[PDB]
Amino acid sequence: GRSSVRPYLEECTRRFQEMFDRHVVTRPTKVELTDAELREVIDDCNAAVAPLGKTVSDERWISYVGVVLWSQSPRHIKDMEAFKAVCVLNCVTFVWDDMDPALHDFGLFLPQLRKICEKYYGPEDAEVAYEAARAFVTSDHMFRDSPIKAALCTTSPEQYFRFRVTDIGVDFWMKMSYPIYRHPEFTEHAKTSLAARMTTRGLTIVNDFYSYDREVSLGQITNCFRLCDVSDETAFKEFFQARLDDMIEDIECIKAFDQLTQDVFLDLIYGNFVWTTSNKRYKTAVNDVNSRIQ
Amino acid sequence: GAQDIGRSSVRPYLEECTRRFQEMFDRHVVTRPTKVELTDAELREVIDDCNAAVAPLGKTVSDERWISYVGVVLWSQSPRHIKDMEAFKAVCVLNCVTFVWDDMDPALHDFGLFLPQLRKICEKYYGPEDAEVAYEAARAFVTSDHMFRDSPIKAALCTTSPEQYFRFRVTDIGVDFWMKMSYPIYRHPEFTEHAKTSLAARMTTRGLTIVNDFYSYDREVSLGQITNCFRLCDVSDETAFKEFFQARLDDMIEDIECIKAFDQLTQDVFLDLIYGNFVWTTSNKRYKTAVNDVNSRIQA
Ligand SMILES: C=C(C)[C@@H]1CC[C@]2(C)C/C(F)=C(/C)CC/C=C(/C)CC[C@H]12
Ligand SMILES: C=C(C)[C@@H]1CC[C@]2(C)C/C(F)=C(\C)CC/C=C(/C)CC[C@H]12
Ligand SMILES: [Cl-]
Ligand SMILES: [Cl-]
Ligand SMILES: [Cl-]
Ligand SMILES: [K+]
Ligand SMILES: [K+]
Ligand SMILES: [Mg+2]
Ligand SMILES: [Mg+2]
Ligand SMILES: [Mg+2]
Ligand SMILES: [Mg+2]
Ligand SMILES: [Mg+2]
Ligand SMILES: [Mg+2]
Ligand SMILES: [Mg+2]
Ligand SMILES: [Mg+2]
Ligand SMILES: [Mg+2]
């Protein structure tokens, strides 16, 4: 009844895309990694999660990494070592997101994050990236079955998106991504988390729509469509339009930022959507790339 | 009289809004904030550090002005939970000297002179790790306050909706900075994590900002400052003002009721911050007249 948004899949996909075409216009661009670059990334990912004891397949890594390939801003890239770092860090904390909390070993995993950060970044940037990775994995862990999560995800969209600034990983993403661009304004917006606060709703509403069926099946409550009656087409449509309006208002305000920063913000939101709709992770509730790692 | 005088002041609403705020706190927070009493030695140690830090910028600040700045720390921390009084004094100093920065013409903003003083304060009162977090947060605040003077981003975030506006204020009202320099006071691991993710700041931004904005509106409008949520409604129209004000009270209440899901120590800290800021704001000459000897623009 409320267990699926499948009836709305085609209409909502078309409405998301129309919104992007009218308000962002320019398509996101996929970063093409060389084979050598992709192997270096996947090798670092496997090394980082090996102490945790679970095998991750190449195609699951590729499912995770696609968000970085599609949602950065390739024409503004300056530092491909920072880009590779974001690939690795994004992927290995994605595994953490998918893991049963019994597998979460901070003593084994935190040094791996530190190693990744020092390898690919300079001394100061490595500290910023590591703290943000540390804060993300700690947050994902401590909020599993937390009353705080229950209160923030069941009260209002406002409370929910406030939780997601950290929990969807976008604050972490900004703080590990600014070395890719070496653009002083973007670096400040990343470090104040204004960059994350501006892009949270656009990332989260899309992720939530397409991951609803999986999350509802697993008992995960971190999803804004749980705030509406999805079995009621009229109530769903009103809620979905309110969320579309949220995304538009953010995008229109993002266009007040400097031309480079606004490119990075918009490529992030629109790229996430392109990646989400072509990724098997977001298609069936349980499959070989989104199954709980138990 | 070409000016929109009718929209230039919330003075007609002063008594009724103050009473409504207080009723809200009494119904939803209940327990009073507690003022930290500093020794005369401690206070003088704080003020001498404050004067040392802003001396390179060229402007004298009176003890009365410092005391006007420092009261928010005295009233809005959580005395029952304090473990580290050196961290508390760091927050007194860091709060006060960045208040001066907030009040200064941007021509006085000298990062080369001022950033080393902030680093010196942090290195004096905190351990090495805590000092780096507090310095980064102070740096990011003073850089933000400077960057956004006359900025199109500020205009867009402050004139679109309450949601865009409060998103700006998570940094601009200084509360993220506040959390990241206050967690060493409490040495409470959950509070430290909520500080470092900025969830602490996000939970408390609206309660701090709505109160600050109401009582600093007249001064800010007279100085042409646009960072104030009541510029989003027509304060000259009583019906529209009261509808907007009720919407802001509802925002505060929703945050406070969600804050009550946090662990007991964290929620005490969050609620003392919001309610203490209200007690301080309503007792402080800074928030009583548009221009006076403690809130006037510090001019180049
Ligand atoms: C941050 C970005 C734009 C996107 C937004 C959706 C995301 C793919 C989903 C999710 F799985 C996260 C929370 C776990 C990993 C966190 C960061 C690194 C990645 C967070 C991901
Ligand atoms: C460095 C301090 C702490 C920063 C500096 C200027 C500030 C905007 C002043 C004002 F708005 C305060 C007294 C209300 C909220 C207090 C804290 C959370 C942060 C307050 C701010
Ligand atoms: Cl560096
Ligand atoms: Cl934030
Ligand atoms: Cl320390
Ligand atoms: K809306
Ligand atoms: K409201
Ligand atoms: Mg998650
Ligand atoms: Mg997940
Ligand atoms: Mg390095
Ligand atoms: Mg999801
Ligand atoms: Mg397969
Ligand atoms: Mg200010
Ligand atoms: Mg001010
Ligand atoms: Mg004000
Ligand atoms: Mg009028």
Residue numbers in the entry:
A (entry chain A): 14 to 307
B (entry chain B): 9 to 308
Q: Which statements did the authors publish about this structure?
A:
In this study, we intended to probe the structural dynamics of the CotB2 reaction using X-ray crystallography of the catalytically relevant protein states in the presence of a substrate-analogue. Remarkably, we could capture the closed conformation of CotB2 by co-crystallisation with the substrate-analogue 2-fluoro GGDP (FGGDP) and determined the crystal structure at 1.8 Å (CotB2wt•Mg2+3•F-Dola (2-fluoro-3,7,18-dolabellatriene); Figs. 1c, d, 2a, Supplementary Table 2). FGGDP is functionalised with a fluorine atom at the C2 position of its hydrophobic tail that interferes with the propagation of the generated carbocation(s). Most likely the fluorinated substrate alters propagation of the carbocation and hence we do not observe the native product. Additionally, active site residues R227 and R294 make contact with the oxygen atoms of the diphosphate moiety to compensate its negative charge. The closure by the C-terminus is initiated by formation of a salt-bridge between D111 and R294. Additionally, Y295 establishes hydrogen bonds to the diphosphate moiety derived from FGGDP as well as to N220 of the NSE motif.
To elucidate the dynamic interactions of TPSs with their substrates during catalysis, we investigated the bacterial diterpene synthase CotB2 as a model system. CotB2 adopts an α-helical bundle fold that is conserved among class I TPSs (PDB-ID 4OMG17). The CotB2 protein sequence exhibits a modified aspartate-rich DDXD motif12 deviating from the conventional DDXXD motif and the NSE triad NDXXSXX(R,K)(E,D) as found in bacteria and fungi, that is altered to a DTE triad in plants. Upon substrate and Mg2+ binding, TPSs undergo a discrete conformational change from an open, catalytically inactive one to a catalytically active closed conformation.
